[PDB]
Amino acid sequence: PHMPFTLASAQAIFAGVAPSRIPAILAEFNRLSIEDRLGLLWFAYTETGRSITRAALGAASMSLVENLLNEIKQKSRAEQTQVMIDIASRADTPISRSYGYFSANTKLGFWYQLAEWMAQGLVAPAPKDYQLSSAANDLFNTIKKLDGGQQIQVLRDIVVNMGFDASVAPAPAPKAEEFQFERTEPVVSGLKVDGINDPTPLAYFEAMNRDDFETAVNLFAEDGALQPPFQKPIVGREAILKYMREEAQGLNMRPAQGIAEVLPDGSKQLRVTGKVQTPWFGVNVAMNLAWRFALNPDGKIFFVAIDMLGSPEELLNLRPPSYR
């Protein structure tokens, strides 16, 4: 009584989340000292900071970054050093709580602008000067082996999980942290995805590529879910649309091959792969992704998982029975 999908059985399609070195890297990072973490972030960012899109965030998000960074700027070098520690360790402090309330791209923008100020000498370069442990230097080496997309996904996971959240069920973020980006490249040309004819996943890509989230969210079942890489599923159309507006806007998605299986009741499981650009890096970083779709018999998306991949070989279709 495989059908219909539940969230669990949907999560399990095509052997579940694509295998990755990222979880072990994040777990190892989280066991380091706070100084080792900040120092490693300085070096990790020194690889990738050149290719970051300058001036990416919109006005309202930039105002939040700049207000908080102002409060930081007029602290002493010692207090500034301590504030980076408080945020990075998710300490209960006013500034760490303020950071905790930021949507994800506002958090990334905060550190971007801080890193610029650290270069103007407007803020203490304490991360630059931290003495890394062997464990930290070993982890650095491991990270440098990841592909470009994997490296920025590690940075992102680390940055967005910083700050203190005082509430177990916080409010949705302000409507001004929505639609943060303005596109630079033309919308991706009408997709041919070798192996995928089903109109649902093709409409999904078409809508997301032109920021048409009203279309995209209406492709979901009422109780449908969207699972971002190494994140919990976002469930129902209200939550999914809010998330799409906050975090899935301005992406260029180039799925190019995939496969389907039809279940006896007409449900369908699909796994599509290809390359995606984030407005944070533009054409500079092509992330290798897989989308795993579970469709109900009416063609609605019950579930879509987005898995971060690491290699060209992971783009190919998986091989039953184990889906390797």
CB of 302 to ligand ECH, least distance (A): 15
Burial of residue 59 (number of CB atoms within 10 Å: 0-12, 13-18, 19+): exposed
DSSP secondary structure, 47-77, as one string? HHGGGSPTT-S-HHHHHHHHHHHHHHHTS-H
**Range in contact with ligand ECH (rule: CB under 6 A) among 94-102, 149-157, 179-187, 256-264:** 149-157
Q: How far is CA 223 from CA 93, 231, 240, 267, 308, in A?
A: 37, 18, 10, 15, 24
Q: How far is CA 76 from CA 4, 95, 207, in A?
A: 59, 15, 48
> Considering the rule CB under 6 A, would residue 45 count as an interface residue with ligand ECH?
yes
Residue 13 or 155 with smaller CB distance to ligand ECH: 155
Which of 153, 269, 288, 296 binds ligand ECH (CB under 6 A)? It is 153
Looking only at residues 177 through 236 of this chain, which bind ligand ECH when binding is defined by CB under 6 A?
208, 228-229
> Considering the rule CB under 6 A, would residue 127 count as an interface residue with ligand ECH?
yes
> Considering the rule CB under 6 A, would residue 42 count as an interface residue with ligand ECH?
yes
Residue 153 or 269 with smaller CB distance to ligand ECH: 153
Collapsing DSSP to helix, strand or coil, 226 comes out as strand
> Considering the rule CB under 6 A, would residue 117 count as an interface residue with ligand ECH?
no
**Range in contact with ligand ECH (rule: CB under 6 A) among 28-36, 93-101, 106-114, 134-142:** 106-114
**Range in contact with ligand ECH (rule: CB under 6 A) among 4-12, 66-74, 105-113, 295-303:** 105-113
Burial of residue 228 (number of CB atoms within 10 Å: 0-12, 13-18, 19+): middle
Whether 284 contacts 187, CB under 8 Å: no
Q: Of 319, 246, 313, 242, nearest to 279 (Cα)?
A: 246
Residues in contact with ligand ECH by CB under 6 A are: 38, 41-42, 45, 52, 108, 111-112, 114-115, 118, 127, 152-153, 155-156, 159, 208, 228-229, 247-248, 251, 253, 276, 278, 280, 287, 289, 291, 306
